[PDB]
Design a protein around this nucleic acid. Structure first.
Ligand SMILES: [Zn+2]
Lengths: 235, 263, 341, 150, 91
DNA sequence: GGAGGCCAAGATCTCAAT
């Protein structure tokens, strides 16, 4: 509840972005930032505060916060990369100063690393590398600036652990038309299927956190969309 | 019941039902598939893997761990009495027709040689390596819904959790022994219809032009050439109509290119 | 219950390097990049997170101590729970997926699992990448070339006996012969590679077949060698690393940090300073860093940062500024309820 | 079991040069640079590490003893392992990953291979590069020209 | 900068003896035909016990053309520990 | 005498390069 104007936020991508099937939405990032600012994890409290900085569309039940859209320059375009996470079992970890291994004949039973419950996990995920990341929203520019600059939030999946989707140089520039939910009849964010918007069909919650709550039949845009950075700055 | 593993069992791996043995009443989930006991009717198999873990398996999930050397050959001569298992078949695929309840094994030449005569009466076997799966999917008139297992692999538990039914040529889910999370579902989806459309429209261009297009899209997808250079190349060789057929996702582009270069 | 944001810099006293599978091509070794070869590299936050998790694990091991017999009181299962976060015996609590604030008791008893999570319990510690500030702060370090210790220093030959000198001569001759033969095989393989692109679709198979067979001929040729399977004299490939004195921006956070969990984190950073190195190639003393973090929090009820203090890690010592940080460290040190088993 | 940090300076009495394969070009001989073509040079830590490793090897050779003929008990393989860190016979005690306290006995009995290590055994000694303090502390030396003596 | 990670007395003594023997011919690099490579170096040895806030200086090693100077009883103790340990098998 | 533990075996092949 405030004077909310439509803004476009452009951030410089520093790390490849991992997309969990559905493109990350800006309201998700702001929800995480507010869950860190408000020392509370209750969805009710965070949503109650999030509505003070993001416009909430009662009719659709979704925040005026667009999904991720990669901004490509002529110098660099959308690329394909993998997010590599591994177990590094150093000689310190495999030492008797840390744990007491089971002993047979006095020898220490070695950790079976090729497989089993104790295997080196070579977990790899697809990631996308583009020069810029762009979101559209309607809300307080000051609060969103502060949250994006100071909170521990990234764009994508598991920024807390892997630091995927690290960004900096958050630029917010005002828009003329609200392009946060719809644009020429195509949904720009997960919206209810009955909204009449076109897009890829899927099952997901409508408000953050998107891993919690009943999953309704939604319509969302393509997970990987690219726009030229020159055309994004036009506003 | 209404689980992808049941369809695989019925179509393909019910052949070794006689060798499974009788179930035991169990009180915990199937660690292999994770589904609730309410779809087991209370019966399951108690198994100990080489890691010495007590795992409960339903009938469909147990067929991946059953050794029937007289039916499935033997994979390692050093262990004469242990037959080839669906749970240890690296490099072997299968296209499963759910409605017709029939399956088609895609095994390489070595595995086919290891297979006894009695096997071929129960399961239709196609001689095709891992790289030749795409040829079989492309050329064959597929019947949907289907389950396409790309690689049975050794990690059964992750294969079983990753099984998904392909409802149309738009989204064929390639199922492997890698766990199918939502973050990596782009790698395990094949847009066969769009690949076939691109292959149909790739015939209007020269072989040199086709190779230029493939190399430019592959380099651009790996951030090896600047978009300006790629666009100049595409304009020069008149490949813009082809570029509009590719998905924006670089990983989908790479999957489609990998399909085109194989067919 | 508050969020502690660590904003600061990391200065490299020595080159800083890391090997990642997808960034290391066959053409050479490269740092992770968010794009092509012209993009600026970064030091992964996963490596920093792993180093700091190991430091916290060492803090816990030191705190708990050793049993009367001198053996560590952690078995393999607890060791992997604390170190990697996996549960190898299936004895871990499986919280219901619906709730978010789960494991409150476990988070209260085990600060390390609360900071750095386990499978099924999200961790409160977020550790970001180390993004460089400049534009030419990375270079191809390492390199060098392994030599033969007896062809460089002639005084070493006086130590060898006649049979050993003969063995050395045989070794050198075999190395030269194998080098020439393998060079010929590689030349033929490259000739195949150049015409591979011009080859027809049908020919795409057997050319790869001959390349494969050439590869096992190289392997068999190296197997034929008797004195040594590997050529002693060889160029060492350089590794890419951040230059000495590179300034890298680092961001770290603890979400809903109790005084005990934040105290464990500060203690881990204190213990990390004894050997403050990230990455690998430690044989060239790579990875050694000095960092200063400005610990800050959020003002309650409004979106205004509040500075609580500052942590400075230098080769000359660790400087913790701010009464709040000392309160956190003391709270961790005084707690008598933790059970990491 | 302590960590020792040797922080100090190397003062140069005669010009200090080194030929690194990836640093020299067709244009001319250049020192390895601290990142980039226009940055300050450095002396590689690899050269210092190799020199000190061979010095330690000779310490060990002298300490073990030399017979009346001036020959060391070590065969060729021991010399290569202690100085180059390379094994030629293939008898090096390879430690399969997962071994608890992998190098314990080897490190306790062989301080040289504990300090400097080999493939599969992390060495405890890390010897870093040498960085100049000021600017223009490098230059082109050597030069000259060979001439007919007659 | 040089460091030894988790150095016992014997291994530190071997390293210090390597530095002492290095001082006889303190030559780095190549082009020795022009006597290139002579150096003189001084290192300040410090140790840092994990869990503490400051390191403690053990001594200093000074390599000069006029000799080798080693200060601090700890470095002498390291050298004596190496030179008096007879359980080393280098084969 | 399971019971711990190790070791060898199992299909065919992966193009991106300032
Ligand atoms: Zn099951």
């Amino acid at each position: 509840m405030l004077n909310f104007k439509p803004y476009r936020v452009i951030m410089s991508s520093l790390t490849p972005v991992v997309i969990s099937g559905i493109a990350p939405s800006l309201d998700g990032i702001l929800y995480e930032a507010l869950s860190q600012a408000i020392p509370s994890n209750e969805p009710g409290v965070v949503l109650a505060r999030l509505k003070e900085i993001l416009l909430f569309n009662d009719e659709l039940g979704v925040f005026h916060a667009s999904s991720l859209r990669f901004g490509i320059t002529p110098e660099q375009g959308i690329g394909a990369t993998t997010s590599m996470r591994c177990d590094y079992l150093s000689p310190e970890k495999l030492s008797t100063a840390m744990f007491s291994p089971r002993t047979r004949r006095g020898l220490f039973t070695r950790v079976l690393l090729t497989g089993g419950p104790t295997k080196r996990r070579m977990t790899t995920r697809p990631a996308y590398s583009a020069p810029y990341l762009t979101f559209d929203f309607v809300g307080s520019s000051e609060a969103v600036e502060i949250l994006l600059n100071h909170a521990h939030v990234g764009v994508g999946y598991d920024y807390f652990s892997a630091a995927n989707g690290e960004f900096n140089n958050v630029t917010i520039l005002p828009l003329d038309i609200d392009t946060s939910i719809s644009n020429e009849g195509m949904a720009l964010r997960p919206v209810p299927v009955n909204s009449g918007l076109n897009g890829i069909k899927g099952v997901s919650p409508l408000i953050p956190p998107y891993f919690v709550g009943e999953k309704l039949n939604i319509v969302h845009p393509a997970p990987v969309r690219t726009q030229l950075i020159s055309s994004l700055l036009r506003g | 019941m209404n689980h992808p593993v049941e369809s695989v069992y019925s179509a393909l791996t019910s052949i070794l039902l006689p060798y499974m043995g009788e179930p035991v009443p169990v009180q915990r989930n199937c660690s292999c598939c994770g589904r609730a006991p309410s779809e087991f009717d209370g019966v399951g198999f108690e198994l100990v893997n080489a890691y010495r873990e007590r795992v409960v398996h339903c009938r469909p999930c147990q067929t991946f761990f059953v050794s029937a050397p007289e039916l499935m050959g033997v994979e390692n001569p050093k262990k004469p009495t242990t037959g080839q298992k669906f749970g240890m078949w690296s490099g072997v695929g299968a296209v499963i027709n759910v409605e017709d309840n029939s399956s088609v094994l895609l095994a390489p030449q070595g595995v086919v040689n290891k297979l006894p005569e009695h096997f071929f009466d129960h399961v239709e076997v196609i001689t095709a390596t891992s790289g030749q799966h795409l040829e079989y999917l492309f050329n064959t008139e597929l019947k949907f819904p289907l389950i396409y297992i790309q690689n049975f692999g050794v990690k059964t538990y992750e294969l079983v959790r990753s099984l998904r039914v392909s409802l149309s040529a738009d989204a064929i889910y390639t199922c492997a022994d890698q766990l199918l999370t939502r973050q990596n579902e782009v790698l395990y989806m094949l847009d066969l219809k769009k690949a076939k459309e691109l292959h149909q429209e790739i015939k209007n261009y020269s072989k040199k032009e086709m190779d230029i297009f493939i190399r430019t899209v592959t380099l651009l997808a790996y951030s090896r050439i600047t978009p300006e250079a790629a666009s100049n190349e595409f304009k020069k060789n008149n490949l813009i109509p082809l570029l509009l057929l590719l998905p924006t996702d670089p990983h989908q582009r790479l999957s489609i290119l990998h399909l085109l270069k194989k067919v | 219950m508050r969020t502690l944001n660590f904003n600061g810099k990391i200065s490299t006293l020595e080159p800083l390097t890391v090997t990642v599978k997808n960034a290391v091509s066959t053409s050479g070794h490269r740092l992770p990049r968010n794009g092509g070869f012209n993009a600026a590299p970064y030091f992964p936050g996963t490596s920093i997170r792993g180093t700091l998790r190991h430091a916290a694990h060492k803090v816990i091991v030191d705190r708990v101590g050793l049993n009367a017999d001198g053996k560590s009181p952690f078995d393999l299962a607890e060791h992997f729970m604390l170190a990697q976060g996996v549960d190898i015996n299936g004895e871990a609590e499986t919280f219901a997926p619906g709730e978010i604030n789960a494991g409150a008791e476990l988070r209260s008893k085990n600060p390390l699992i609360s900071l750095f999570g386990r499978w099924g319990l999200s961790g409160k510690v977020g550790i970001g990448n180390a993004i460089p500030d400049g534009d030419n702060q990375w270079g191809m370090f390492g390199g060098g070339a392994r030599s033969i210790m007896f062809q460089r220093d002639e005084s070493l030959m006086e130590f060898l006996e006649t049979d050993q000198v003969d063995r050395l001569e045989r070794l050198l001759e075999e190395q030269a012969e194998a080098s020439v033969d393998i060079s010929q095989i590689k030349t033929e393989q490259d000739a195949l590679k150049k015409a591979m692109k011009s080859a027809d679709k049908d020919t795409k198979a057997e050319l790869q077949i001959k390349v494969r067979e050439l590869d096992e001929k190289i392997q068999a040729r190296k197997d034929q060698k008797q004195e040594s399977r590997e050529s002693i004299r060889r160029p060492i490939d350089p590794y890419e690393a951040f230059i000495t004195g590179a300034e890298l921006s680092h961001r770290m956070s603890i979400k809903n940090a109790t005084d005990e969990e934040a105290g464990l984190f500060i203690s881990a950073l204190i213990r990390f300073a004894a050997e403050p190195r990230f990455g690998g190639h430690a044989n060239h003393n790579c990875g050694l860093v000095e960092a200063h973090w400005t610990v800050t929090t959020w003002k309650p009820g409004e979106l205004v940062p509040v500075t609580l203090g500052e942590i400075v890690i230098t080769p000359n010592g660790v400087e913790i500024t701010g009464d709040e940080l000392f309160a956190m460290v003391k709270a961790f040190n005084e707690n008598q309820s933790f059970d990491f088993t």
